[PDB]
Tab-separated table of C-alpha atoms and ligand atoms in Angstrom:
chain	number	residue	atom	x	y	z
X	2	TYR	CA	-33.753	62.955	201.325
X	3	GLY	CA	-30.824	64.916	202.690
X	4	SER	CA	-27.259	63.670	202.415
X	5	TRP	CA	-27.424	62.278	205.972
X	6	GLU	CA	-30.728	60.507	205.195
X	7	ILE	CA	-31.093	56.941	203.945
X	8	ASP	CA	-34.292	55.707	202.274
X	9	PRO	CA	-35.533	52.839	204.493
X	10	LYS	CA	-37.045	51.198	201.403
X	11	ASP	CA	-33.436	50.482	200.371
X	12	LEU	CA	-33.026	48.178	203.404
X	13	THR	CA	-33.541	44.409	203.539
X	14	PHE	CA	-33.715	43.071	207.114
X	15	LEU	CA	-32.119	39.649	207.496
X	16	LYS	CA	-31.221	38.774	211.107
X	17	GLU	CA	-31.444	40.115	214.642
X	18	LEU	CA	-28.047	40.803	216.189
X	19	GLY	CA	-29.044	41.998	219.653
X	20	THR	CA	-31.586	43.809	221.804
X	21	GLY	CA	-30.679	46.359	224.468
X	22	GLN	CA	-31.513	49.566	226.329
X	23	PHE	CA	-30.918	51.779	223.287
X	24	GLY	CA	-33.028	49.545	221.022
X	25	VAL	CA	-32.703	46.620	218.612
X	26	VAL	CA	-29.858	46.051	216.147
X	27	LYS	CA	-30.383	44.022	212.984
X	28	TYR	CA	-28.188	42.779	210.173
X	29	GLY	CA	-29.342	43.655	206.699
X	30	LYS	CA	-28.436	44.637	203.172
X	31	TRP	CA	-28.570	48.085	201.588
X	32	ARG	CA	-29.791	48.044	197.974
X	33	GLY	CA	-29.645	44.255	197.929
X	34	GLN	CA	-25.856	44.064	198.094
X	35	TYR	CA	-24.059	45.952	200.882
X	36	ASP	CA	-23.886	44.643	204.453
X	37	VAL	CA	-25.173	47.054	207.096
X	38	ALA	CA	-26.169	47.118	210.733
X	39	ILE	CA	-29.555	48.735	211.350
X	40	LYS	CA	-30.057	50.192	214.824
X	41	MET	CA	-33.745	50.789	215.613
X	42	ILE	CA	-33.786	53.313	218.440
X	43	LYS	CA	-36.098	52.594	221.367
X	44	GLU	CA	-38.894	55.155	221.572
X	45	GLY	CA	-38.228	57.764	224.248
X	46	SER	CA	-34.604	56.811	224.855
X	47	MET	CA	-32.845	59.564	222.874
X	48	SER	CA	-33.017	63.322	222.300
X	49	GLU	CA	-33.855	62.658	218.679
X	50	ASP	CA	-33.794	66.170	217.186
X	51	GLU	CA	-30.403	66.847	218.784
X	52	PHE	CA	-29.136	63.463	217.610
X	53	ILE	CA	-30.266	64.068	214.019
X	54	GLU	CA	-28.491	67.433	213.884
X	55	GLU	CA	-25.301	65.865	215.221
X	56	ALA	CA	-25.599	63.005	212.710
X	57	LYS	CA	-24.722	65.562	210.019
X	58	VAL	CA	-21.351	66.144	211.700
X	59	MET	CA	-20.891	62.408	212.319
X	60	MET	CA	-21.213	61.806	208.561
X	61	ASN	CA	-17.940	63.720	208.107
X	62	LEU	CA	-16.034	61.575	210.635
X	63	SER	CA	-14.381	58.810	208.615
X	64	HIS	CA	-11.444	56.650	209.638
X	65	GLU	CA	-10.660	52.997	208.984
X	66	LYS	CA	-10.785	52.286	212.741
X	67	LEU	CA	-14.070	54.136	213.423
X	68	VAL	CA	-17.317	52.252	212.836
X	69	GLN	CA	-18.725	54.057	209.821
X	70	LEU	CA	-22.022	55.949	210.004
X	71	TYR	CA	-23.820	55.577	206.687
X	72	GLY	CA	-26.899	57.629	207.538
X	73	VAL	CA	-30.136	57.830	209.476
X	74	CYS	CA	-33.788	57.154	208.669
X	75	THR	CA	-35.824	59.827	210.422
X	76	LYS	CA	-39.088	60.117	208.478
X	77	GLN	CA	-40.689	57.354	210.582
X	78	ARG	CA	-40.522	55.861	214.072
X	79	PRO	CA	-38.472	54.186	215.364
X	80	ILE	CA	-35.622	56.134	213.797
X	81	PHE	CA	-32.928	53.919	212.284
X	82	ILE	CA	-29.158	54.422	212.473
X	83	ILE	CA	-27.411	52.700	209.563
X	84	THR	CA	-23.806	51.726	210.282
X	85	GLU	CA	-20.923	49.498	209.264
X	86	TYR	CA	-21.484	45.783	209.922
X	87	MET	CA	-18.926	44.169	212.279
X	88	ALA	CA	-19.305	40.417	211.937
X	89	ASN	CA	-17.601	39.435	215.205
X	90	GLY	CA	-19.683	41.719	217.402
X	91	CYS	CA	-18.764	43.456	220.636
X	92	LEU	CA	-15.095	43.553	221.684
X	93	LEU	CA	-15.922	42.775	225.310
X	94	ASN	CA	-17.640	39.485	224.393
X	95	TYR	CA	-14.863	38.677	221.909
X	96	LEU	CA	-12.166	39.085	224.584
X	97	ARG	CA	-14.070	36.790	226.946
X	98	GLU	CA	-14.203	33.929	224.415
X	99	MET	CA	-11.212	31.920	225.588
X	100	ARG	CA	-11.130	29.715	222.478
X	101	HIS	CA	-9.335	32.528	220.618
X	102	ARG	CA	-6.205	31.820	222.687
X	103	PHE	CA	-4.917	35.298	221.880
X	104	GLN	CA	-1.235	36.058	221.599
X	105	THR	CA	-0.151	39.292	223.223
X	106	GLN	CA	0.783	40.630	219.780
X	107	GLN	CA	-2.895	40.384	218.875
X	108	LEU	CA	-3.898	42.190	222.057
X	109	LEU	CA	-1.457	45.029	221.328
X	110	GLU	CA	-2.864	45.309	217.787
X	111	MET	CA	-6.350	45.760	219.253
X	112	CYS	CA	-4.997	48.604	221.411
X	113	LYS	CA	-3.385	50.163	218.346
X	114	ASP	CA	-6.653	49.885	216.371
X	115	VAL	CA	-8.488	51.817	219.082
X	116	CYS	CA	-5.667	54.331	219.592
X	117	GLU	CA	-5.635	55.167	215.849
X	118	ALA	CA	-9.358	55.866	215.918
X	119	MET	CA	-8.979	57.940	219.064
X	120	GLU	CA	-6.037	59.917	217.625
X	121	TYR	CA	-8.237	60.782	214.636
X	122	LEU	CA	-11.099	61.909	216.908
X	123	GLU	CA	-8.610	63.961	218.961
X	124	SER	CA	-7.385	65.596	215.746
X	125	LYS	CA	-10.996	66.654	215.102
X	126	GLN	CA	-11.476	67.906	218.703
X	127	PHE	CA	-14.215	65.254	219.089
X	128	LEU	CA	-14.641	63.430	222.414
X	129	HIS	CA	-15.907	59.892	222.625
X	130	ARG	CA	-17.240	60.479	226.187
X	131	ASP	CA	-17.908	56.729	226.864
X	132	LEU	CA	-14.841	54.822	225.639
X	133	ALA	CA	-14.805	51.221	226.874
X	134	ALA	CA	-14.474	47.740	225.393
X	135	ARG	CA	-18.284	47.419	225.410
X	136	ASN	CA	-18.341	50.254	222.819
X	137	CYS	CA	-15.815	48.666	220.468
X	138	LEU	CA	-16.682	46.184	217.731
X	139	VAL	CA	-14.728	43.544	215.785
X	140	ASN	CA	-15.045	42.821	212.063
X	141	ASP	CA	-14.554	39.542	210.165
X	142	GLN	CA	-10.818	40.242	209.796
X	143	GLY	CA	-10.370	40.727	213.522
X	144	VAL	CA	-9.938	44.498	213.264
X	145	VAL	CA	-11.268	46.455	216.272
X	146	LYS	CA	-13.164	49.672	215.617
X	147	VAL	CA	-14.564	52.326	217.937
X	148	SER	CA	-18.367	52.758	218.021
X	149	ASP	CA	-20.999	55.134	219.465
X	150	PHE	CA	-18.550	58.042	219.667
X	151	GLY	CA	-20.393	61.042	221.202
X	152	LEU	CA	-23.661	59.117	221.600
X	153	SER	CA	-24.034	59.568	225.338
X	154	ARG	CA	-24.799	63.268	224.823
X	155	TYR	CA	-28.264	62.296	223.498
X	156	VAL	CA	-29.267	59.543	225.943
X	157	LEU	CA	-32.215	60.777	228.069
X	158	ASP	CA	-31.833	58.159	230.905
X	166	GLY	CA	-26.337	57.916	238.122
X	167	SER	CA	-26.658	54.169	238.677
X	168	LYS	CA	-25.542	53.373	235.092
X	169	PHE	CA	-22.723	55.921	234.724
X	170	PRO	CA	-19.293	54.545	233.600
X	171	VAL	CA	-17.607	55.113	236.977
X	172	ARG	CA	-14.933	52.500	236.276
X	173	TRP	CA	-13.767	54.316	233.114
X	174	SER	CA	-13.787	57.828	234.625
X	175	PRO	CA	-10.913	59.954	235.974
X	176	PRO	CA	-11.101	61.662	239.380
X	177	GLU	CA	-12.006	65.065	237.911
X	178	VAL	CA	-15.060	63.545	236.188
X	179	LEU	CA	-16.183	61.722	239.335
X	180	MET	CA	-15.555	64.791	241.528
X	181	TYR	CA	-16.557	67.722	239.326
X	182	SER	CA	-17.923	66.460	235.959
X	183	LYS	CA	-14.858	67.837	234.148
X	184	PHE	CA	-14.856	66.140	230.746
X	185	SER	CA	-11.969	66.736	228.332
X	186	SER	CA	-9.593	65.007	225.953
X	187	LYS	CA	-7.877	63.750	229.100
X	188	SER	CA	-10.984	61.932	230.358
X	189	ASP	CA	-10.971	60.046	227.023
X	190	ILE	CA	-7.259	59.322	227.679
X	191	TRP	CA	-8.077	57.886	231.123
X	192	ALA	CA	-10.794	55.670	229.642
X	193	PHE	CA	-8.429	54.443	226.938
X	194	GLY	CA	-6.020	53.274	229.631
X	195	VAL	CA	-8.837	51.300	231.296
X	196	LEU	CA	-9.707	49.883	227.865
X	197	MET	CA	-6.128	48.653	227.411
X	198	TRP	CA	-6.467	47.046	230.839
X	199	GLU	CA	-9.727	45.351	229.708
X	200	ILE	CA	-7.993	43.991	226.595
X	201	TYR	CA	-4.962	42.621	228.430
X	202	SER	CA	-7.271	41.191	231.120
X	203	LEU	CA	-9.328	39.319	228.455
X	204	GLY	CA	-12.455	41.259	229.336
X	205	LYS	CA	-12.449	41.212	233.125
X	206	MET	CA	-14.499	43.940	234.847
X	207	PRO	CA	-12.171	46.755	236.001
X	208	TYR	CA	-12.055	46.851	239.821
X	209	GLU	CA	-13.992	43.591	239.708
X	210	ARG	CA	-14.280	43.112	243.488
X	211	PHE	CA	-15.587	46.670	244.077
X	212	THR	CA	-18.908	48.416	243.643
X	213	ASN	CA	-19.019	51.667	241.674
X	214	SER	CA	-19.090	53.671	244.919
X	215	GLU	CA	-16.079	51.758	246.228
X	216	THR	CA	-14.263	52.298	242.924
X	217	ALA	CA	-14.835	56.057	243.084
X	218	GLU	CA	-13.366	56.193	246.609
X	219	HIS	CA	-10.401	53.999	245.567
X	220	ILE	CA	-9.562	56.198	242.577
X	221	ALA	CA	-9.965	59.495	244.412
X	222	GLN	CA	-7.561	58.192	247.088
X	223	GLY	CA	-4.947	57.755	244.338
X	224	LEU	CA	-5.172	53.982	244.031
X	225	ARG	CA	-5.180	52.299	240.652
X	226	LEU	CA	-5.722	49.208	238.573
X	227	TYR	CA	-2.605	47.064	238.471
X	228	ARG	CA	-0.757	45.058	235.838
X	229	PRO	CA	-2.666	42.367	233.930
X	230	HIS	CA	-0.777	39.085	233.780
X	231	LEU	CA	-0.525	39.287	229.967
X	232	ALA	CA	0.854	42.845	229.876
X	233	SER	CA	4.609	43.324	229.638
X	234	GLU	CA	6.217	46.032	231.755
X	235	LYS	CA	6.381	48.281	228.684
X	236	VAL	CA	2.676	47.788	227.939
X	237	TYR	CA	1.772	48.444	231.573
X	238	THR	CA	3.746	51.687	231.527
X	239	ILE	CA	1.606	52.861	228.612
X	240	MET	CA	-1.764	52.105	230.200
X	241	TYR	CA	-0.627	53.457	233.599
X	242	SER	CA	0.463	56.739	231.989
X	243	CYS	CA	-3.233	57.319	231.207
X	244	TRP	CA	-4.086	57.494	234.928
X	245	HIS	CA	-2.047	60.415	236.251
X	246	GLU	CA	-4.093	62.218	238.896
X	247	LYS	CA	-3.240	65.490	237.118
X	248	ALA	CA	-5.084	65.510	233.789
X	249	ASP	CA	-2.465	67.732	232.119
X	250	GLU	CA	0.225	65.099	232.836
X	251	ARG	CA	-1.611	62.422	230.817
X	252	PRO	CA	-0.407	61.895	227.252
X	253	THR	CA	-2.199	62.639	224.017
X	254	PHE	CA	-3.491	59.919	221.719
X	255	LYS	CA	-0.705	60.851	219.285
X	256	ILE	CA	1.908	60.112	221.961
X	257	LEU	CA	0.101	56.936	223.031
X	258	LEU	CA	0.104	55.726	219.420
X	259	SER	CA	3.837	56.376	219.123
X	260	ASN	CA	4.456	54.520	222.377
X	261	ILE	CA	2.340	51.555	221.233
X	262	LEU	CA	4.087	51.372	217.861
X	263	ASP	CA	7.451	51.445	219.653
X	264	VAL	CA	6.453	48.503	221.849
X	265	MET	CA	5.122	46.687	218.781
X	266	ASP	CA	8.590	46.948	217.229
X	267	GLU	CA	10.399	45.890	220.420
X	268	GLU	CA	8.026	42.956	221.000
Z	1	0B9	O1	-24.712	48.684	218.561
Z	1	0B9	C1	-24.839	48.277	219.715
Z	1	0B9	N1	-25.051	46.984	220.000
Z	1	0B9	C2	-25.045	45.937	218.990
Z	1	0B9	C3	-25.606	44.640	219.559
Z	1	0B9	C4	-25.533	43.527	218.516
Z	1	0B9	C5	-24.119	43.367	218.005
Z	1	0B9	N2	-23.644	44.642	217.462
Z	1	0B9	C6	-23.236	44.792	216.174
Z	1	0B9	N3	-22.932	43.681	215.489
Z	1	0B9	C7	-22.499	43.794	214.225
Z	1	0B9	N4	-22.314	44.908	213.526
Z	1	0B9	C8	-22.613	46.026	214.207
Z	1	0B9	N5	-22.527	47.308	213.753
Z	1	0B9	C9	-22.958	48.150	214.755
Z	1	0B9	C10	-23.308	47.429	215.857
Z	1	0B9	C11	-23.090	46.051	215.534
Z	1	0B9	C12	-23.624	45.706	218.467
Z	1	0B9	C13	-24.741	49.242	220.900
Z	1	0B9	N6	-25.092	50.605	220.521
Z	1	0B9	C14	-26.357	51.039	220.159
Z	1	0B9	C15	-26.575	52.400	219.879
Z	1	0B9	C16	-27.839	52.809	219.517
Z	1	0B9	F1	-28.069	54.127	219.247
Z	1	0B9	C17	-28.887	51.931	219.418
Z	1	0B9	C18	-28.645	50.598	219.698
Z	1	0B9	CL1	-29.955	49.466	219.584
Z	1	0B9	C19	-27.401	50.133	220.066
Z	1	0B9	C20	-23.378	49.236	221.544
Z	1	0B9	C21	-22.166	49.507	220.716
Z	1	0B9	C22	-22.371	48.160	221.320
């Protein structure tokens, strides 16, 4: 077993958490004690050899606000991805549960959680490439963490492309960069302050792409202060080089935290 490789005999499977296009995710214990999520990858869905090689680099990405990769099980099929367990599940579903009755201070803390993770990835020159609330998870303490960073590079399956999280230069020319992650982060802040509404909810993807290329934008969620709106809107400059960095976004968010 290599350092990126977990012995599947060390896993105890306890509950199913969800089933989707990338496979089935289960809750279990590692060596009888440690909570893990076990992702069993659907056969034929991923470029598995490429994914395994990249898993070695993913092992070295570690930040309190990134969902932790513990290792992979690749000797058998389906391959397993072993990750940090996040008891409260997907951020998008969490936002849509109105019983939480969130205060805006809690919403800003979720944005800061994500921005800290994203600042760390930026410092490692690592792109998420599909940042959205559906790819964030929530633990039992209510902390939001960023998941599936870089995963889309290995998905073999466009009618399912994240149009609504993409800047004009991605939609027009497939120009991915740090600044396309910045754009997506702004949409993610909009999702959080909108309690999980679909961005451009009344539009199709094709209509959204035309809207955005014409220079039109999402507008202020009811729960976002003017200062919070300024931060998310700064992510959507037509010119990619005029968008901030995640370091600057984090500073701006911390400043608003103090003021509010
Ligand atoms: O993980 C995913 N979906 C689960 C559904 C059940 C609820 N989840 C969790 N609940 C508790 N702890 C948890 N840790 C980790 C996840 C998790 C999220 C998705 N990614 C994905 C990637 C793959 F390569 C193979 C598969 Cl099958 C899925 C996507 C990020 C949302």
